[PDB]
Structures are given as C-alpha cells and as structure tokens.
Amino acid sequence: QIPLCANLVPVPITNATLDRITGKWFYIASAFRNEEYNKSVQEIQATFFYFTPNKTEDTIFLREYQTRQNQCFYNSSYLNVQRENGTVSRYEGGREHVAHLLFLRDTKTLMFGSYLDDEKNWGLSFYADKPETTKEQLGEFYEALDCLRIPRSDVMYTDWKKDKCEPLEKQHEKE
C-alpha cells in the first residue's frame, strides 16, 4: 500500500519532533555507500546517548557513550537543528556532518540519513529506545535500506554484550 521510499523523504522538524526524540537512545545498526562513514562506523562495538533539545536555540545537547577497542569514550556536544530541511548537524574534526532525521512506523525507533541526495554515498543509521530491537523494528529499517538499494548484508550492527560504558554512565548519574 505505502511506497517503499515514503519514509526516506525529508520531514521538517517541529517542537513535537524534538519532544519525540528527547531522551535515551541506543545505536542499533547502519549501512552506507560512503566509505569514510563505513570506516568510522566499523570500529563501534556499542553506543548509547541522550538527546536534550533546546527548542528555543534549535540545538540538541548530546551526551554520548561509545564503546570502541573495548573501552568507553564519552563525549558531549551540541547538535544544530535545521528545522525546515529536517536535518541535524554535528561538528567533528574540521567538519560539519549533516543528517536527515527520519522515522519508521514504530515510535520507539528513529533513523538518520546521510548523503541522501547522492546514490554513490547515501546511507542510514538506526536507533531504538532499547539496545535490542524487535523483528518488526528491524524489518522497518531493512525496508528503508531496500529503498536505497543497500543490501541487508551490508549492515553493521552493534553488540550490546560489548558495552563498556554502563559504569561511566552510573558514575555520571550519581553526580
């Protein structure tokens, strides 16, 4: 009934959109045609993070707990929001990375689309309110990949068993 690509169309970000993405997310999986993104993403064993939007400033405060090479790397920073374009941006190195905020039928998930205008480079990353997804949520992501003609076999997944960031998160919570 609903076209494969319907939820790959940019959607403007409202106050409700910002409310909807507020809180804790787990990075589930990604796949890109861009090789630099594949390279950086390869190394990620696990990641959880917190979104705290500032609706008046169109920014999102990001607190990120990433496991790589069996250790926890914590970073916080501000993401900028481009409301009408339906994108969020993050500054790492000397580089502003822009991504489209996209949604699946399931309200407990979200995707970021990168280089979506470029068939040589496009890709998607998938997040959930739990470190483990249901088979329905995973199928939604696969369908979004299906639209970009990215094979399901190219997906790179996190492994929650590998998380090294639980201890640091709790040592922040007490503070």
CATH number at residue 89: 2.40.128.20
In the numeric block, which tokens belong to residue 135?
Answer: 């088979």
How determined? X-ray
In the numeric block, which tokens belong to residue 44?
Answer: 């990620």
The four Cα atoms 24, 28, 32, 37 give a dihedral, to 10 degrees, of 60
Q: Domain of residue 45: give its range.
A: 1-175
DSSP 56-108: TTTEEEEEEEEEETTEEEEEEEEEEEETTTTEEEEEETTEEEEEEEE--SSTT
Region of 86 (left: φ > 0; alpha: ψ -120 to 50; beta: rest) is: left
The four Cα atoms 6, 12, 15, 18 give a dihedral, to 10 degrees, of 60
Q: What is the H or E stretch that residue 44 is in?
A: strand 44-54
> How many domains, in total, are found in the chain?
1
